[PDB]
Amino acid sequence: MIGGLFIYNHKGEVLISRVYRDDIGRNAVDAFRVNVIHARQQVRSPVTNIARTSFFHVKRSNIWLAAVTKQNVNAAMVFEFLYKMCDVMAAYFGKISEENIKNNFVLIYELLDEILDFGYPQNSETGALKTFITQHQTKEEQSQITSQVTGQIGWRREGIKYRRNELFLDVLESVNLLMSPQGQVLSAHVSGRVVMKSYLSGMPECKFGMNDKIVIESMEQKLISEEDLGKQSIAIDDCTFHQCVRLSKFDSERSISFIPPDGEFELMRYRTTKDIILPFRVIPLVREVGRTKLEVKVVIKSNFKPSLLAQKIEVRIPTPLNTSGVQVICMKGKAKYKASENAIVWKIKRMAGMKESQISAEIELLPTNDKKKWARPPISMNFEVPFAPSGLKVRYLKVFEPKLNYSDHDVIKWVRYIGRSGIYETRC
């Protein structure tokens, strides 16, 4: 379906030359190098057309990757394949560099040709790949591999044994927040995923509950149990899944079925663009004194439970560029200034909830605010916080091993709720 797929370094020579079509020419490849790899201009696109020829060439890192084709395809699946490729490269050997490619060359080649033959892309389920795809068959092994291929079950499921059956979850909630510098939450959204680290035997299908259509309602049920009309739980604004789920099962009854693999993985990522909890009440704003002085007023009211303790509190307060006369205000924490970035680093060792530290700033200037003027860099609060902002949490969690012995109770469960607010930026 596709031809050459060539990985490139910075110096531009191939790190691989992995062709899958006749049409592919050396005259083509070196041209691609000297023209994309080398170009006086520097604004480009991961996809490229040169003489009616597509070129999905990407630097997924310092290391590059060129996907050459002259066949109209879905670019999206091409990129999906590129991802899966580099991602499994990492999964099998972590870092991906010169030696990472070299000392894997043969596996690389056989995989690529398999996972994509003449451009026809095959799967990368790696249900048992790395076993025989290892950096010599038996009749049982022959039939075994043949069947596991024919077997419509992946993600490393053959029936495993773990001396215990336990899973540790970690709910990460990334605070996708923009608020008006005068105070109005322009962006109130959250990006979160269910990463699942599991240590269990066998191949269990598991289910799980997370409060739906209502704000939230073996050994520890919950320390923060879902009080009726509890923490923010909403129709998930967008719930994203992974190929263990059964969306047929969902859209039938709003519940997929997932046979999870073992070890760590991301069970389902999700987004909600509403119904969040604010950790502070900051009105960061700047004012200008004719044109000889820019003054910034930063009143950082922190707002959480004082029992909650955020640490290493570093708020980004850009100082005006031209600096003649400084005017500093201190309430609590540590006064730190940032030069070469022209910023008040109101760096505080730690903060409890429901607090307020105000810094008012004046910085004398020289007129440069013209038809082109000062860029107002959003004042941001950056710090540490674990948190269940929505607090949409485990409505239940159904795990088992309905084959031999170990039941629900024979599994010990966990979760973490790690908020993530580095997106706390506003000055303009």
Binding site: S218, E220, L223, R416
Partner: peptide, 6 residues
């Protein structure tokens, strides 16, 4: 954050 759950 490092807390036991079930």
């Amino acid at each position: 954050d490092y807390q036991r759950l079930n």
